[PDB]
């Protein structure tokens, strides 16, 4: 179905489609690889400029994403792609009929997980080789060990050990042996998220109910337990900057910053992502930085920061609340109508079904500005017949724009759905 | 960062080091008692002699200062310097100075304490190195020339910007600006940590506690509109109340009662939170005046809360704790008091709890009902649970006597309840 | 010959000795096993001098290989050098009416 005139290039105005992103670094440059359906992008995190984008589409949507140093590991319908700067360079077809559900990488061992509880371990062809290509082995977890595979992690300082967190317990698999070396005890609550703490041998498990279990593998024991009820825990992160703060992102779209030393709730952020689209699908501290990147499923990606404390002596007791820092976003729904703002092809207006007009840049995606809806005061200065609370206009069914006199009066006219008047907009 | 900001940082790091005669005359002229000229012209041995006399006076007052005579008030304490010492010794100095300010927070009307603190200021530079502990210490004396002098000579950390307005004027700081200081949120966390240190060292007093509670009540009154601000101000004040109840002194318990009462009548809390507050109060209740104010507090809290499950019965543990720490004759004479505060929902829940659990003191129940003027839905609830208790328990003469009392007062309600449930 | 006590006092006074104050300050205080092992993880031996990070991990110039348990102990010590071990995970673990039920409800509700 390929053409002789056109060719797909990229996608404007998308930051995430709900699949949890992955952070990584190249020395000073911190990057964030985020999926958009069949095509991922790689953002910077120092300034959130776009850095790379996958030039070739995947035939289906990407299911899993990971990224160590200079390689991005995508997992769509059956295969794993090892890509470099968005250029696909190694495909890896699994020898099954299932779909790849989880993925991790450590040392010379890629570890994928297909939904019928089937783990695949891949070895690099050389210790100095860059990506695992050779198929090492395949393991399976039947139902006597645990439930469905929820997550794969690799704890630090574990020679060829892989931590498999299922819905019921926590297993340790040695891939050099291909053997389950240690199964943990049973938890009455189904586990949803896992996170390797920067402390040794300890993983945090967020369950379906409000339980954050700090569990140690060496003792095989629940060291600590934090109770948040009426909440499904959806993301966990640890401040590695030099303080003991935990970030719990619950699927009602909330963030809670806990202090583990004083056993306190430092702060809570309400509705940083839309609850209807899953809420906070990932919250992640930057490694060694007081900056948390929070992505939702509503095509929104924010970055918050922690200021230094104002108290000279106390500090960690008098900790500052999280300041909002930079962000990108898009539409919740698909856009309804689009137009080009000028002959230079720099900006594009797009109105969607979510009752919102947005002007996107084209060059580098740093300028995805929502167009405000803040009414101008009338020249008469009289009263307007309207309610007490603001609410966005209905969806835009037609649009027209000119640039012959921009910045001297209005130059966009938008016709809304089921509305007996069209609005003007200043560009 | 901008180079001006980085040089400001290095100035704040080398703040207390005198690198010329002018900066030395500044750091030495800043004094607590003497003015600028004589403060500049006098000397360390003069100051230390006055310090030793003032502190032996203070040890005569109370024997706690002898350790500071041993370690902070010696001739080697003349000889040393802050900056030439290492980081560990700096931290140890700050710990000793915080202990001393915590101790001398309570005698600020005494010229001996003023003289000892003058020595500490002009030798160890507390008014430059650690101003937060000193200001949290002497905040409650905000209408005193000592506090005005501290405000004139101090360098202000960024939280005390209202006092930064009030520097070098001639009027004391106002109650309104004290309210603004405590109305800032992070300053409340600062003062929370300070009160926690004060509690864990068990050195609190009536004037400090009174100023604390008056500021807190005025703060929640100033925030009596913003429900988001009230909700995010719940954990601070309620945690201060929790640890102030964990303390043992009757002053701390009455201050916690006051904060709890005003908070629960300014913002409608949850039933579980009010039951938890009642549980901690009943657990740590010890003394007579604390008992009196605590009974008034439970009255106020149950009079505030209102919802589905308003007058339901107390749980087993809370009810047993209440009848342990309180007697029927005491609650009876409290009802017999002349003021008669509105114990409607509280007496209703207490009566239903007694009727479920004990089923013995029904004459005491009758005395409560005859003493208090009840309310219609509460009497309806009482009659329904009494119907259930009559049908479960064996029939009692005092039980049918309570029924006859209802015949005296509104038999028709008993008829409506019995026709909804029974004959 | 050791010094006398009174001449030690005189020496302190003359030289301006402050270590007695220093000890008073530093002594001042407010008076008022595992679950699993692995045989191949024990008996595994890895090379050492083949890369710079493990040449950093080692301790002896002439050693070239070490077994798995010592290798992983050196690795854990390096990981500790990276991330300092915190008190919340070191010194704390969970395992008539009370006084902190109010605090527990304050913890459990927003």
């Amino acid at each position: 179905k390929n053409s002789k005139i056109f060719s797909p290039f990229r996608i404007i105005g998308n930051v995430s489609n709900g699949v949890p992103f992955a952070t990584g670094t190249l020395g000073s440059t911190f990057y964030i690889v985020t999926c958009v359906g069949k095509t991922f992008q790689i953002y910077d995190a120092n300034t959130l400029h776009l850095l790379f984008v996958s030039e070739k589409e995947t035939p289906s949507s990407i299911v899993a994403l990971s990224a160590h140093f200079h390689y991005v590991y995508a997992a769509y319908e059956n295969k794993v792609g090892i890509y470099k700067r968005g250029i696909e360079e190694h495909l890896l077809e699994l020898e099954t009929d299932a779909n790849v559900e989880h993925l991790c990488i450590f040392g010379d061992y890629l570890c994928a997980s297909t939904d019928d509880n089937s783990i695949f371990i891949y070895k690099k062809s050389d210790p100095q080789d860059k990506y695992p290509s050779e198929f090492y082995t395949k393991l399976t977890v039947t139902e006597i060990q645990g439930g469905e595979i929820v997550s794969l992690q690799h704890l630090a300082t574990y020679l060829n050990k892989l931590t498999v967190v299922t819905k019921s317990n926590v297993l340790l698999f040695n891939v050099r042996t291909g053997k389950l070396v240690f199964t943990s005890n049973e938890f009455p609550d189904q586990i949803t998220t896992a996170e390797p703490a920067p402390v040794l041998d300890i993983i945090a498990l967020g369950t379906v109910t409000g339980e954050v279990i700090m569990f140690n593998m060496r003792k095989g024991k629940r060291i600590r337990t934090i109770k948040i009820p009426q909440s499904r825990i959806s993301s966990l992160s640890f401040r590695t900057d030099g303080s003991s703060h935990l970030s719990v992102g619950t699927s009602s779209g909330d963030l809670i910053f806990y202090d583990l030393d004083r056993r306190s709730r430092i702060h809570v952020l309400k509705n940083i992502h839309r609850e209807s689209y899953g809420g906070v699908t990932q919250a992640t501290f930057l490694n060694g930085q007081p900056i948390i990147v929070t992505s939702g499923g509503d095509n929104s990606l924010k970055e918050y920061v922690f200021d230094p404390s104002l108290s000279q002596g106390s500090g960690d007791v008098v900790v500052q609340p999280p300041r909002y820092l930079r962000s990108r976003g898009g539409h919740s729904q698909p856009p309804s109508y689009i137009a080009f703002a000028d002959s230079q092809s720099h900006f594009m207006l797009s109105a969607s079904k979510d009752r919102s007009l947005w002007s996107f840049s084209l060059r580098k995606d740093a300028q995805s500005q929502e167009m405000s809806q803040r009414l101008h005061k009338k020249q008469d200065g009289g009263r307007v017949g309207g309610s007490t609370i603001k609410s966005k206009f209905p969806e835009i069914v037609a649009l027209a724009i000119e640039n012959a006199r921009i910045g001297e009066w209005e130059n966009i006219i938008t016709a809304h759905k089921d509305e007996k008047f069209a609005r003007t907009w200043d560009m | 960062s901008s180079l001006s900001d980085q040089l400001a940082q290095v100035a704040s790091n080398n703040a207390t080091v005198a690198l010329d005669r002018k900066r030395r005359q500044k750091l030495h002229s800043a004094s607590l008692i003497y003015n600028s000229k004589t403060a500049a012209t006098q000397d360390y041995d003069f100051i230390f002699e006055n310090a030793s006399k003032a502190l032996e006076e203070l040890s005569q007052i109370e024997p706690k200062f002898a350790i500071f005579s041993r370690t902070l008030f010696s001739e080697s304490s003349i000889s040393l310097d802050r900056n030439v010492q290492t980081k560990e010794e700096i931290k140890d100095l700050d710990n000793a100075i915080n202990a001393y300010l915590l101790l001398a927070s309570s005698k600020w009307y005494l010229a001996p304490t003023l003289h000892a603190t003058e020595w500490l200021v002009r030798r160890f530079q507390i008014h430059v190195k650690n101003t937060e502990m000193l200001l949290l210490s002497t905040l409650n004396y905000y209408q005193t020339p000592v506090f005005k002098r501290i405000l004139s000579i101090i360098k202000l950390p960024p939280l005390f910007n209202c006092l930064s307005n009030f520097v070098r004027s001639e009027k004391p700081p106002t109650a309104l600006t004290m309210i603004k200081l405590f109305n800032d949120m992070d300053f409340l966390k600062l003062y929370t940590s300070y009160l926690d240190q004060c509690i864990k060292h068990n050195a609190t007093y009536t004037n400090q506690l009174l100023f604390t509670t008056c500021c807190f009540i005025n703060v929640v009154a100033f925030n009596s509109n913003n429900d988001e601000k009230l909700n995010q101000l719940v954990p601070i004040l309620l945690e201060i109340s929790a640890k102030l109840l964990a303390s043992k002194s009757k002053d701390c318990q009455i201050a916690a009662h006051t904060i709890l009462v005003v908070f629960a009548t300014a913002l409608p809390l949850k039933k579980t939170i009010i039951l938890a507050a009642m549980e901690t109060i009943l657990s740590n209740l010890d003394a007579k005046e604390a008992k009196h104010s605590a009974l008034l507090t439970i009255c106020k809290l149950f009079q505030t809360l209102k919802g589905q499950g308003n007058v339901d019965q107390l749980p087993s543990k809370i009810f047993k704790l209440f009848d342990s720490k309180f007697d029927t004759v005491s609650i009876l004479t409290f009802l017999d008091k002349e003021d008669k505060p509105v114990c409607d929902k509280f007496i209703t829940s207490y009566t239903r709890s007694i009727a479920r659990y004990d089923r013995s003191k029904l004459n005491i129940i009758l005395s409560l009902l005859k003493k208090i003027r009840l309310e219609r839905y509460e009497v309806r609830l009482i009659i329904t649970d009494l119907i259930y208790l009559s049908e479960i328990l064996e029939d009692k003469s005092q039980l049918v006597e309570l029924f006859e009392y209802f015949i005296s007062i509104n038999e028709d309600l008993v008829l409506k309840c019995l026709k909804s449930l029974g004959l | 010959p050791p010094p006398d006590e009174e001449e030690q006092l005189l020496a302190k006074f003359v030289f301006g000795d402050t270590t007695d104050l220093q000890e008073n300050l530093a002594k001042f205080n407010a008076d008022f096993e595992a679950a699993w092992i692995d045989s191949d993880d024990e008996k595994i031996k890895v090379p050492i001098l083949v890369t710079n990070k493990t040449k950093k991990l080692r301790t002896s110039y002439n050693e070239s290989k070490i077994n798995g348990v010592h290798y992983i102990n050196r690795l854990r010590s390096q990981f500790e050098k990276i991330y300092p071990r915190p008190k919340w995970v070191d010194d704390e673990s969970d395992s008539n009416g009370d006084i902190n039920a109010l605090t527990k409800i304050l913890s459990t509700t927003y």
Binding site: D108, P127, A156, G288, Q289 | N161 | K53, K65, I82
Partner: peptide, 28 residues
């Protein structure tokens, strides 16, 4: 004057890290 809560630029400094390729090692 109320308390100033000024914002300032954030600088993402260098981040040391742990090596999973040092964790996974070959057998003897």
């Amino acid at each position: 004057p109320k308390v100033v809560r000024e914002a300032k630029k954030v600088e993402m400094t260098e981040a040391r890290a742990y090596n999973a390729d040092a964790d996974t090692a070959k057998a003897a």
